[PDB]
């Protein structure tokens, strides 16, 4: 499992409510507690529930010094389109990376080779670029965005309190 491994090098276009398109690299994921969530496709049939539940928790997550990135094999262009032409996804303030080359979906071992889409997986990365938590559910079973603040806290506690885990 990628648990405990370090994020591999990548470069991709992203969109964020506010700033116009900008590049992103393995670097941005280093130096801060980043949490990236993957999802099938933009403009999909399934309701963007997962994505916005995260938006709600975003306010708080930022306080904990955490950054949030959503990823799908769609182009950053459609991410913007989706963001505008939809109230739900329009409330998202965090970063939306586009992975049309499939490279970053593939590196997190979450790309479904035959559909060309990513799986519902969420990763939590420590300031060192190391994966500390992995959650991948099948289409239908939802990811509870609330349990995130707990995990990142727990992750951060153990970060400067080794062995004190009981």
Nearer to ligand [N+], 48 or 129 (CB): 129
Alpha helices in the chain (DSSP H): 49-63, 76-84, 87-90, 103-107, 147-159
Least distance in angstroms from the C-beta of 16 to its own copies: 16
- Annotation says 47 is catalytic: yes
> Residues 59 to 78: which contact its own copies by CB under 8 A?
73-75, 77-78
Neighbouring residues of 77: CB distance < 8 A, sequence distance ≥ 6: 98
How many helices (DSSP H) and strands (DSSP E) are in the chain?
Answer: 5, 9
Could you give the 3-state DSSP secondary structure of residue 60?
Answer: helix
- 115 makes contact with its own copies (CB under 8 A): yes
> Residues 18 to 77: which contact ligand [N+] by CB under 6 A?
27-28, 30-31
- 116 makes contact with ligand [N+] (CB under 6 A): no
Tell me 28's DSSP state. G
Cα separation, 134 vs 142, in Å, equals: 14
Pairing state of beta strands 120-125 and 131-137?
antiparallel
Cβ proximity of 133 and 121 under 8 Å? no
Which one among 6, 26, 100, 149 touches its own copies, defined by CB under 8 A?
100
Which of the following is catalytic: 3, 27, 46, 47? 47
Annotated catalytic residues are: 47
Which residues of this chain interact with ligand [N+], rule CB under 6 A? 27-28, 30-31
Q: Residue numbers of the site for its own copies (CB under 8 A)?
A: 1, 3-4, 41-47, 49, 73-75, 77-78, 80-82, 85, 99-103, 109-110, 112-117, 119-121, 124, 131-142, 144, 147, 150-151, 154-155, 157-158, 162-163, 165-166
């Amino acid at each position: 499992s990628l648990i405990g491994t370090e994020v591999q090098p990548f470069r991709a276009q992203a969109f964020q409510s506010g700033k116009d398109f900008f590049e992103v690299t393995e670097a941005d994921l280093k130096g801060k507690w980043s949490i990236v969530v993957f999802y099938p496709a933009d403009f999909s049939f399934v309701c963007p529930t997962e994505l916005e539940d995260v938006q709600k928790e975003y306010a708080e997550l930022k306080k904990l010094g955490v950054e949030v990135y959503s990823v799908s094999t769609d182009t950053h262009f459609v991410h913007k389109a989706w963001h505008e032409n939809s109230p739900a996804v329009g409330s998202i303030e965090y970063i939306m990376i586009g992975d049309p080359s499939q490279t970053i979906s593939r590196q997190f071992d979450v790309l479904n080779e035959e559909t060309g889409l990513a799986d519902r997986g969420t990763f939590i990365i420590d300031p060192d670029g190391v994966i500390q938590a992995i959650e991948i559910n099948a289409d239908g079973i939802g990811r509870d965005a609330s349990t995130l603040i707990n995990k990142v806290k727990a992750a951060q506690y153990v970060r400067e309190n080794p062995g004190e885990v009981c």
